[PDB]
């Protein structure tokens, strides 16, 4: 599966290693949440990442289904 990743600048798409067949978006507030919004983390995963109490996690299994909120999926 191909997935968006926040590990690069600018955001780009990476092919996930074998056995990692989901994309994930993870969002949470940091100190600047009032002005900039929630932190965004995008990547690959085998199992959907477990959500910490303050986090928001979305997992999906189609190519590039985890875009940065300011961009189109696919």
């Amino acid at each position: 599966i191909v997935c968006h990743t926040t590990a690069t600048s600018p955001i780009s798409a990476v092919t996930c290693p074998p056995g990692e067949n989901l994309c994930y978006r993870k969002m949470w507030c940091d100190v600047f949440c009032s002005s900039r919004g929630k932190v965004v983390e995008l990547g690959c995963a085998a199992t959907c990442p477990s959500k910490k109490p303050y986090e928001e996690v979305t997992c999906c299994s189609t190519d590039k289904c985890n875009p940065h909120p300011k961009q189109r999926p696919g």
Binding site: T6, S9, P10, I11, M27, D30, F32, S35, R36, G37, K38, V39, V40, E41, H68, P69, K70, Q71
Partner: peptide, 12 residues
């Protein structure tokens, strides 16, 4: 780096 939903540009 660090991204936020407000922009596609990274922070530190």
């Amino acid at each position: 780096w660090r991204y936020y939903e407000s922009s596609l540009l990274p922070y530190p």
